[PDB]
A paper describes a structure:
Here we determined the x-ray crystal structure of Staphylococcus aureus MurE UDP-N-acetylmuramoyl-l-alanyl-d-glutamate:meso-2,6-diaminopimelate ligase (MurE) (E.C. 6.3.2.7) at 1.8 Å resolution in the presence of ADP and the reaction product, UDP-MurNAc-l-Ala-γ-d-Glu-l-Lys. This structure provides for the first time a molecular understanding of how this Gram-positive enzyme discriminates between l-lysine and d,l-diaminopimelic acid, the predominant amino acid that replaces l-lysine in Gram-negative peptidoglycan. The structure reveals the enzyme in a ternary product complex with ADP and UDP-MurNAc-l-Ala-γ-d-Glu-l-Lys within the active site in a closed conformation. Although the two structures in this study do not differ substantially, as assessed by comparison of r.m.s.d. values between them, inspection of the ATP-binding site of the product co-crystallization complex shows that two side chains take on a different conformation. These side chains, Phe-300 and Lys-360, are both in the vicinity of the binding site for the adenine ring of ATP. In the case of Phe-300, the phenyl ring is rotated by roughly 90° to accommodate the adenine ring, and this movement displaces a network of two ordered water molecules. As with the E. coli and M. tuberculosis MurE structures, as well as those of the preceding enzyme in the pathway MurD, a specific lysine residue (Lys-219) is post-translationally modified to N-carboxylated lysine within the active site region and is thought to be required for positioning of the Mg2+-ATP complex. In MurESa, the l-lysine residue at position three of the UDP-MurNAc-tripeptide ligand is bound by a relatively small number of electrostatic interactions with the protein.
Formation of the peptidoglycan stem pentapeptide requires the insertion of both l and d amino acids by the ATP-dependent ligase enzymes MurC, -D, -E, and -F. The stereochemical control of the third position amino acid in the pentapeptide is crucial to maintain the fidelity of later biosynthetic steps contributing to cell morphology, antibiotic resistance, and pathogenesis. The resulting enol-pyruvoyl-UDP-N-acetylglucosamine is reduced with NADPH by MurB, yielding UDP-N-acetylmuramic acid (UDP-MurNAc). This intermediate is then subjected to ATP-dependent aminoacylation with, in sequence, l-alanine, d-glutamate, and either l-lysine or meso-diaminopimelic acid (mDAP), by the sequential action of Mur ligases C, D, and E to produce UDP-MurNAc-tripeptide. As seen with other enzymes of this class, MurESa is composed of a three-domain, mixed α/β structure. Domain 1 extends from residues 1 to 98 encompassing the uridine nucleoside-binding site of the UDP-MurNAc-tripeptide product, domain 2 extends from residues 99 to 332 and encompasses most of the rest of the UDP-MurNAc-tripeptide-binding pocket, and finally, domain 3 extends from residues 333 to 493, with the ATP-binding site formed between domains 2 and 3.
Numbering used by the authors:
A (entry chain A), B (entry chain A): 1 to 493
Write the structure that this text describes.
Amino acid sequence: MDASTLFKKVKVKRVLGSLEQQIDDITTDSRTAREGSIFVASVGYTVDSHKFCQNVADQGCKLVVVNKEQSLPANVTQVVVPDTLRVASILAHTLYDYPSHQLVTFGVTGTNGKTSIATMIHLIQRKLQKNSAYLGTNGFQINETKTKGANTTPETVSLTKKIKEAVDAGAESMTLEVSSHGLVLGRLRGVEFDVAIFSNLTQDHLDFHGTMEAYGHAKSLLFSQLGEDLSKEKYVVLNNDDSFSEYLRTVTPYEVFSYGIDEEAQFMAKNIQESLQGVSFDFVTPFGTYPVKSPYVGKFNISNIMAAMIAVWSKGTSLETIIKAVENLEPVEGRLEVLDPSLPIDLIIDYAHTADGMNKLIDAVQPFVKQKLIFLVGMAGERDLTKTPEMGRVACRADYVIFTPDNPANDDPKMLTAELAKGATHQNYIEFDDRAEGIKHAIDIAEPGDTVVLASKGREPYQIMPGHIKVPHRDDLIGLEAAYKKFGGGPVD
Amino acid sequence: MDASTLFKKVKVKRVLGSLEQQIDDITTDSRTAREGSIFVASVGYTVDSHKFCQNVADQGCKLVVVNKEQSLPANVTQVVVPDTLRVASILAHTLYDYPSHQLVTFGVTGTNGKTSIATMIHLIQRKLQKNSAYLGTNGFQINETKTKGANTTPETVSLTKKIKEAVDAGAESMTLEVSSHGLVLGRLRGVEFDVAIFSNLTQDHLDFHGTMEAYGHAKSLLFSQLGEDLSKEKYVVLNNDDSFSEYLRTVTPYEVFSYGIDEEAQFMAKNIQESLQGVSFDFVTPFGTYPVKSPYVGKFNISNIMAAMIAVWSKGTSLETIIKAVENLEPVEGRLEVLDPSLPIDLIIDYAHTADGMNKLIDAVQPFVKQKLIFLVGMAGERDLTKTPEMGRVACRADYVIFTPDNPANDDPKMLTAELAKGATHQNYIEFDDRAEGIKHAIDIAEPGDTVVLASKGREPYQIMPGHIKVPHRDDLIGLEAAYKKFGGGPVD
Ligand SMILES: CC(=O)N[C@H]1[C@@H](OP(=O)(O)OP(=O)(O)OC[C@H]2O[C@@H](n3ccc(=O)[nH]c3=O)[C@H](O)[C@@H]2O)O[C@H](CO)[C@@H](O)[C@@H]1O[C@H](C)C(=O)N[C@@H](C)C(=O)N[C@H](CCC(=O)N[C@@H](CCCCN)C(=O)O)C(=O)O
Ligand SMILES: CC(=O)N[C@H]1[C@@H](OP(=O)(O)OP(=O)(O)OC[C@H]2O[C@@H](n3ccc(=O)[nH]c3=O)[C@H](O)[C@@H]2O)O[C@H](CO)[C@@H](O)[C@@H]1O[C@H](C)C(=O)N[C@@H](C)C(=O)N[C@H](CCC(=O)N[C@@H](CCCCN)C(=O)O)C(=O)O
Ligand SMILES: Nc1ncnc2c1ncn2[C@@H]1O[C@H](COP(=O)(O)OP(=O)(O)O)[C@@H](O)[C@H]1O
Ligand SMILES: Nc1ncnc2c1ncn2[C@@H]1O[C@H](COP(=O)(O)OP(=O)(O)O)[C@@H](O)[C@H]1O
Ligand SMILES: [Mg+2]
Ligand SMILES: [Mg+2]
Ligand SMILES: [Mg+2]
Ligand SMILES: [Mg+2]
């Protein structure tokens, strides 16, 4: 469509050159701007991409959106605006014909549980034979096709393009993880949600938000930004076991569905039975109480699966049909996965990376420890360290603790492991600068009948190293390789 | 329409009795429930209206929405829901066919300036010969027809009904004052806004919000609740002279128009000339700079009128035509009105009732004081007193200060005036339990050529007294009557 039409949407602009040209692309990354692209320049944490306008011109781009007039050949049109990224979201949603309005969109936010819930919703939709897309930490997925990405909630143009890809692939719904960063930074501007789901609010990301108050307020935006049009069928799904839900009710007019285990709620889990092979519980609902069998491990995953079921139910699918679908749902990659159960030890991977997440992981696994719990965890580089010793304390619930860096980036890895060590409550721990070395050590220490847990990465396939360089790393593969060496078994070679 | 259709909108409900009946009315006030009404019961600060269901049944109402099953005759249908008021807003907007979606809606929030801006927008629309409605502290107005009300932002059902009245009267737009109370309490659930306008955030209402942080976050809801549908033409108008605007930008994706006097902004006022008869200024805009003549007094009203002009402009009216309309706009009742200029004193009424508002009032009037400034102010009963001595300090910018109660309700009036007195910085003040007595005293003290200001009530026609009883009271009429007695003039009698 033509640039004229697109920029009618923008009231304050200084236009230098013609808007007659056809536009089929928008990008905030100069490296992909071409003839027919709009390149929107912006100020990042690393570079100001206004510096790259000449590059995009060389590549044939004839239209740039900028905060200040640039030095460029006269045949490149410049649109000067006060807020380039705000305009990028307007342009992108317009160009792609409002992709978020074209399918059912589910959004999940919370300190822990975003990937779990979002993936469970996706997997339920697929079990119901519906085309479904997912975007989050585990990347972008349309039905069974997966590609990895750099963020949980990617920057606005990339994100909008992916919603448009889901629409074009024929998705009936798409579920997005909604990071508090993404909300505050405008990455989700223009993304209309139909159902908003909350897991919990516990201490994290204060390097970015400064305070718990600001952090909670950031997550509330997913709920208030649903808007005020009561002719729309929109719904909010809240966790009554988290006290922040009381506040969330006040910021949106749409009907609220509550779930709970400890606290009274509209949907509850009772008579919970746990195993390393999944759970059963009685699912109390406003319409009746029904037996549920779930393949997921732990009470925290009962909260998560209830959130997922209620979200799908809210848009018109019968609970009976959802409960049937949940029974043999596939694993959520990296989230409490029991590896090769034929081993003479329990070998579990999990993504726990905050104190609360670790407590929930250990709560779930500990009842099944026959002998000793061997627990490896990493601390992420370049993140707030204030709750790191607390993570070290929680880890010392285990019998033997291994501390490692996780994505140390430019941080000294020994500083990360030493910070974890400051919280230890017993002397049975060890620190490794190299996480792979730490994993092999965990297997060295493990006896038949022991339980080994590798926490904070799941199957995340890299360590972010100095210069922010990704080096290949797989907890699961390193763990298994070390385990087969020690105990035997494993596929032929 | 029939109750069945209405309640299809509510997913969690326990229905006792038939929904076949016709519904033409909804009410949260039992006193107006009749056959064909839905009565929604709720828990207020004073009474739980669930107690009144039998009354509504006696009056012929056959449908109640309740949080718990009630004792009622079997022929009354009960719909039991978890959140009655949330359902009231859903039912009301549905029943009245989404009245806020049917005209352009402007919403104004801020500590001071809501009535001023909202009224200015209304008056501009009328000057442009467009049907316009206004709802706020000065009541409900459709074109020139006014009725008074109990709140700035009335409870959800009454508010929705008034939007529906504006639609039915043929209004092309309606402007609502948006109180932080109204936002938090859900009074505006279902009210879609097209333009949101911010004035300022200064200390007020902490008896309700507890903190400035929570208070600011409450006002941010007007902006985030605009939603995320970028196919809609919605706009945000922010004051760059207020530091809270930086935060407000982050909570909405829509284009932001900024105004400013002290700080750089897209729309600014320069070369400001002031009189008691209005102002002139050069209005810098993104499209050019234009001379503006405004009948309103003071720099604070220049901020307000710029906000009003930009809001109307944003929905497609030319600035030139708006600027012409502003020239002889009518007064905003109670807000810096110069009374009978034929008097040998300046006699001014104004609604200033916080420290910041008082400073802005005194800033506006002081350059025109030839001799002495005689300044009367009241403190509201049953409100947070923490900034009351500060109000007393600000008042002592005047030469002679009179302290009175304003709507003391059940508070001891002497406690209110004494709290004001604690901030005084000179000895030239006096306190009166009776505000009318204080006004007459102000005139007693005034010499020809003096300036008398009566602040905090405007033309508000009552004092709220013990038992929360309204007794007639008019600052303007009492002031004028006393002034004519002392100085002569005034209409024959
Ligand atoms: C601090 C931050 O925000 N940098 C994000 C930001 O970089 P920069 O601003 O530095 O980019 P830069 O300045 O290079 O470029 C600015 C702009 O210029 C463009 N430009 C750049 C170069 C060029 O040649 N041409 C060009 O046009 C570029 O496309 C961009 O539009 O823009 C990128 C692109 O959009 C994101 O990819 C980055 O995200 C990183 C990966 C991140 O780690 N971000 C974190 C802070 C984050 O967003 N986290 C949340 C939550 C997830 C999370 O935090 N998870 C935990 C997990 C912990 C357990 C791990 N085992 C954690 O990481 O702590 C999320 O991803 O949604
Ligand atoms: C504390 C509060 O919120 N009580 C509001 C609230 O009463 P209650 O909860 O006590 O009502 P109650 O408990 O009696 O009844 C509950 C429910 O039962 C129903 N019910 C009641 C009786 C009955 O016979 N039958 C029946 O069905 C009734 O309709 C209601 O649905 O419900 C009313 C109806 O909806 C409002 O009219 C009240 O608002 C008062 C007037 C107020 O003063 N409210 C203030 C707190 C307020 O809302 N302020 C903002 C901002 C304006 C402001 O604060 N301005 C300053 C001005 C200062 C300068 C003045 N010169 C100030 O006042 O400080 C605003 O109005 O939007
Ligand atoms: N609802 C929950 N409450 C507490 N901890 C949880 C919850 N869900 C998952 N976790 C823990 O946190 C880790 C991260 O879960 P995930 O669903 O990836 O959260 P997020 O996507 O918000 O980071 C899991 O591997 C598990 O240890
Ligand atoms: N923009 C402003 N900034 C500061 N004070 C103002 C502003 N506008 C009005 N005031 C002062 O506050 C009083 C109340 O103004 P009004 O527009 O009624 O505000 P609100 O409706 O928010 O209470 C006025 O009479 C004036 O003294
Ligand atoms: Mg998080
Ligand atoms: Mg995630
Ligand atoms: Mg106020
Ligand atoms: Mg007002």
